[PDB]
Amino acid sequence: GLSDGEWQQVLNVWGKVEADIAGHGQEVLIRLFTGHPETLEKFDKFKHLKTEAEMKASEDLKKHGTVVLTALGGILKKKGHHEAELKPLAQSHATKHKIPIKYLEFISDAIIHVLHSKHPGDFGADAQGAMTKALELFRNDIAAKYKELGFQ
Numbered sequence: 001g002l003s004d005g006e007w008q009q010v011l012n013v014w015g016k017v018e019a020d021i022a023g024h025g026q027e028v029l030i031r032l033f034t035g036h037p038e039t040l041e042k043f044d045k046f047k048h049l050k051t052e053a054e055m056k057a058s059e060d061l062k063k064h065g066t067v068v069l070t071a072l073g074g075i076l077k078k079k080g081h082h083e084a085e086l087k088p089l090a091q092s093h094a095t096k097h098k099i100p101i102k103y104l105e106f107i108s109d110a111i112i113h114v115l116h117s118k119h120p121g122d123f124g125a126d127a128q129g130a131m132t133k134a135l136e137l138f139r140n141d142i143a144a145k146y147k148e149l150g151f152q
């Protein structure tokens with residue numbers, strides 16, 4: 001649950017992402033894969049990437065970063081009223097991709113890391129607080145759907 005002022009902060013931060021969605025999406029995925037290499041194994045189309053240089057050179061990885069962040073942005077713009085948008089993603093991630101909730105924690109922290117890395121000094125303490133709460137709400141509503149499905 002976020003206040004109006006917190007949502008305003010989230011959507012202000014998101015304007016930074018929308019100015020370069022592919023570059024942000026690329027770096028989020030690279031941070032996830034390099035920090036948590038077990039996550040790479042869930043992607044049949046990226047498991048061939050052995051080095052970060054290959055990850056950086058991959059145009060398909062940048063494309064997928066755009067898909068991921070476009071979906072997240074659509075959810076965030078709903079300010080918590082995201083049941084219709086979140087349900088298919090919870091279902092596909094539990095039943096088809098088999099993504100444990102832990103990996104959604106990993107990517108949430110990776111988003112925070114990338115924002116500080118690309119906007120040092122321009123991602124303030126209030127903005128970090130509000131973005132963190134928004135990603136927690138996203139993860140928590142996914143977790144509720146995971147429990148319904150019995151997925152661990």
Ligand code: HEM
Binds near residue numbers: 069072092104
């Ligand atoms: C911010 C969180 C995330 C968002 C919004 C997101 C969004 C999406 C979207 C929109 C798709 C394509 C449609 C679909 O299959 O439902 C996708 C595919 C996928 N997601 Fe996620 N995702 C997230 C986190 C993750 C994480 C943490 C993992 C794994 C560590 C992951 C693994 C996958 C895989 C395996 C695919 C299929 C890729 C394919 O072969 O083309 N997702 N995701």
